Design an enzyme around this catalytic site. Structure first.
Site, mmCIF file in Angstrom:
data_model
loop_
_atom_site.group_PDB
_atom_site.id
_atom_site.type_symbol
_atom_site.label_atom_id
_atom_site.label_comp_id
_atom_site.label_asym_id
_atom_site.label_seq_id
_atom_site.Cartn_x
_atom_site.Cartn_y
_atom_site.Cartn_z
ATOM 1 N N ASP A 35 0.838 -1.195 0.000
ATOM 2 C CA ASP A 35 0.000 0.000 0.000
ATOM 3 C C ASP A 35 0.876 1.249 0.000
ATOM 4 O O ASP A 35 1.358 1.667 1.058
ATOM 5 C CB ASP A 35 -0.894 -0.016 1.229
ATOM 6 C CG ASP A 35 -1.815 1.176 1.289
ATOM 7 O OD1 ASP A 35 -1.936 1.870 0.253
ATOM 8 O OD2 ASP A 35 -2.428 1.400 2.367
ATOM 9 N N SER A 199 -0.487 15.603 -11.995
ATOM 10 C CA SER A 199 -0.711 15.257 -13.386
ATOM 11 C C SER A 199 -0.945 16.520 -14.202
ATOM 12 O O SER A 199 -1.487 17.514 -13.711
ATOM 13 C CB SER A 199 -1.926 14.332 -13.478
ATOM 14 O OG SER A 199 -2.297 14.069 -14.814
#
Length: 330
Positions: A35, A199
Site C-alpha cells: 500500500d 498530473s
C-alpha cells in the site's frame, strides 16, 4: 541488494493485489497488500481477536526465534475507506522477494474491522508511503522500504501491476525490460506523507487533451481512480446511460456499454488507461448495471491515482533524498 516479488490480484476484478512476505524465523509467509498510501506493516496474528479472523494466515511471534516484543509500542490506523485495525508491535526479520530487513516493526493486530475479517485473501498490509505516516506510538517506526533503502543498489521500488493478471514489485533496481519507451519522472511532495504529484491533464477516449494540473497521490492500496467531479463527469458523459447513483455510491453504467479509454498526463508524456480497465462489473450478481472504475474524489479531500491508473503503467517510486515518481507505458 535487490528484491523482486510477484503480486497477484485477489479476485477477477483486480480489487486488490497480494504479495507474499516472509516474516520471522523459520519464515512465516503471509500475503500482504502493498500500500503506497500508508506506512504501517501490520498482520493478522495469534493475538487477533478470534472472532475477527476468518481464513487469513496469521503471524505467531512466539514461533519465531527472531521476534522481539517492542515494549510499550501500540498502533492504531484508520483508512480512507472507513476500515481500521490496531494492536501491539514486534520487531522481526522480514523478507520480500529475496530482500531481507532485520529489525522490521511488524504490527500485530489485536483488532481489525469487519472489512478485513471478511476478506480471507489479505493477511495484512505493507505500507510504502513515507514513514512520517507510521502510527506506532510512542516511537514511530520505519517502513520496510525505509529500512531497506541504505542496502539497496538504488533507493527505489517499482510497481508493475497487471490487468486481470499478476504483476511485480521490485526493490532496488529498475527492470528496463518491463516497459516500453522512456520513463517520465515528475516531482513529489512529501508534505502529507504520500507519493503526491501533479498530473498535467487528461483526455477521454479519442478526445483532445485538456491541459490542467491535477494534484493527487499514487496509491497501490486503492482500487479505483478518484478525480475531480468535473473530470469524472466529462468521462462518463461519453458512456450512454451512465449516471451517478447516490444509492450505489458512484457512477454506474449499462453493462452492455463499451467504455472509452482515459488518458492522464505525466509531464509531456501520456498514460492511456484502456476502457476495459474501467469496468468493475455488475453492482450485484446478475445486475445489468456495472460499477465504474473512475469515480469522483469530491468527498475524499484528495485525488487518488489508484490501481486503475497505476496498472496501465510501469511506476517508479524513487526514494532518493528528493523523491520523484516515474511513469512509463508498458
Amino acid at each position: 541488494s535487490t528484491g523482486s516479488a510477484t503480486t497477484t490480484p485477489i479476485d477477477s476484478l483486480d480489487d486488490a493485489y497480494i504479495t507474499p512476505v516472509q516474516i520471522g524465523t523459520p519464515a512465516q509467509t503471509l500475503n500482504l497488500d502493498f500500500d503506497t498510501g500508508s506506512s504501517d506493516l501490520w498482520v493478522f496474528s495469534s493475538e487477533t481477536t478470534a472472532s475477527e479472523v476468518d481464513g487469513q494466515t496469521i503471524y505467531t511471534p512466539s514461533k519465531s526465534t527472531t521476534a522481539k516484543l517492542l515494549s510499550g509500542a501500540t498502533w492504531s490506523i484508520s483508512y480512507g475507506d472507513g476500515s481500521s485495525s490496531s494492536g501491539d508491535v514486534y520487531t522481526d526479520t522480514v523478507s520480500v522477494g529475496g530482500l531481507t530487513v532485520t529489525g522490521q516493526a511488524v504490527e500485530s493486530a489485536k483488532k481489525v474491522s469487519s472489512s478485513f475479517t471478511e476478506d480471507s485473501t489479505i493477511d495484512g498490509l505493507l505500507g510504502l508511503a513515507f514513514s512520517t505516516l507510521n502510527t506506532v506510538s510512542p516511537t514511530q517506526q520505519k517502513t520496510f522500504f525505509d529500512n531497506a533503502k541504505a542496502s539497496l543498489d538504488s533507493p527505489v521500488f517499482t510497481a508493475d501491476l497487471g490487468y486481470h493478471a499478476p504483476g511485480t514489485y521490485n526493490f532496488g533496481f529498475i527492470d528496463t525490460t518491463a516497459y516500453t519507451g522512456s520513463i517520465t519522472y515528475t516531482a513529489v511532495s512529501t508534505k502529507q506523507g504520500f507519493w503526491e504529484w501533479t498530473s498535467t491533464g487528461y483526455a477521454v477516449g479519442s478526445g483532445t487533451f485538456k491541459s490542467t494540473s491535477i494534484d493527487g497521490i499514487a496509491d497501490t492500496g486503492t482500487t479505483l481512480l478518484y478525480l475531480p467531479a468535473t473530470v469524472v463527469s466529462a468521462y462518463w458523459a461519453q458512456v450512454s446511460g451512465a449516471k451517478s447513483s447516490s444509492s450505489v455510491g458512484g457512477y454506474v453504467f449499462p453493462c452492455s456499454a463499451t467504455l472509452p479509454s482515459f488518458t492522464f498526463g505525466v509531464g509531456s508524456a501520456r498514460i492511456v488507461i484502456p476502457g476495459d480497465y474501467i469496468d468493475f462489473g455488475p453492482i450485484s450478481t446478475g445486475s445489468s448495471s456495472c460499477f465504474g472504475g473512475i469515480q469522483s474524489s469530491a468527498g475524499i479531500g484528495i485525488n487518488i491515482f489508484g490501481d486503475v491508473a497505476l496498472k496501465a503503467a510501469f511506476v517508479v517510486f524513487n526514494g532518493a533524498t528528493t523523491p520523484t515518481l516515474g511513469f512509463a507505458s508498458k
